Design a protein around this ligand. Structure first.
Ligand SMILES: Nc1nc2c(ncn2[C@@H]2O[C@H](COP(=O)(O)OP(=O)(O)NP(=O)(O)O)[C@@H](O)[C@H]2O)c(=O)[nH]1
Ligand SMILES: *P(=O)(O)OC[C@H]1O[C@@H](n2cnc3c(N)ncnc32)[C@H](O)[C@@H]1O
Ligand SMILES: [Ba+2]
Ligand SMILES: [Mg+2]
Length: 170
């Protein structure tokens, strides 16, 4: 029986791997194919944390600009928002500031945030230095993790740490 029900949103630029992060966490599957999300997709996953059962309702948003006014509708309900960039794509990291701005515009004032640098397995094509991204996230008091949906690395931890932080402030 459920102790908490948290709503999470994944946002960030098209092609950074939001959908693959959710597929990995919710279905333990992965695809190398690129099929952009139309609007917002939804999955649930129940986790156990600190002896508590937490149901997570997770919305995976389209990163493409033409969906953006619609995706904004889901921001208010979120307890936690995960902002994803691709560690091989500098512009996706540069657009983190824009995404943080969407959060300020549309989200609840007390929303928890996490910055994720995805595709950490692409070690030879990495252009966003993790010390840079970590200094950035520190400067904002936002937690930071690098993930690989492909190799499963830190995927469970990203969702688990987000839940932990939500649970602490209630
Ligand atoms: N090597 C590697 N490739 C990844 C990883 N995650 C996603 N990809 C690849 O990146 C591409 C885009 O992934 P996808 O999850 O569809 O991106 P998205 O952020 O959901 N795009 P949109 O916002 O348009 O729906 C796919 O070709 C996918 O296989 C990762 O951790 N490692
Ligand atoms: P929008 O409000 O159109 O939602 C986008 C998609 O997510 C599905 N969905 C949203 N919220 C839930 C809940 N709370 N439970 C189950 N499914 C949900 C919508 O039905 C849309 O397809
Ligand atoms: Ba949809
Ligand atoms: Mg997607």
């Amino acid at each position: 029986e459920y102790d908490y029900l948290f709503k999470l949103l994944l946002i960030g630029d098209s092609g950074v791997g939001k959908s693959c992060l959710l597929l990995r966490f919710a279905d333990d599957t992965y695809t190398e194919s690129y099929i952009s999300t139309i609007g917002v997709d939804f999955k649930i996953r129940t986790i156990e944390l600190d002896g508590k059962t937490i149901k997570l309702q997770i919305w995976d948003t389209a990163g493409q600009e033409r969906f953006r006014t619609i995706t904004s509708s889901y921001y208010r309900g979120a307890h936690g928002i995960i902002v994803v960039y691709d560690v091989t794509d500098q512009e996706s990291y540069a657009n983190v500031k824009q995404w943080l701005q969407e959060i300020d515009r549309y989200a609840s004032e007390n929303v928890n945030k996490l910055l994720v640098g995805n595709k950490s397995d692409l070690t030879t094509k990495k252009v966003v230095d993790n010390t840079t991204a970590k200094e950035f996230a520190d400067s904002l008091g936002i937690p930071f993790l690098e993930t690989s949906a492909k190799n499963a690395t830190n995927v469970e931890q990203a969702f688990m740490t987000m839940a932990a932080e939500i649970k602490k402030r209630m």
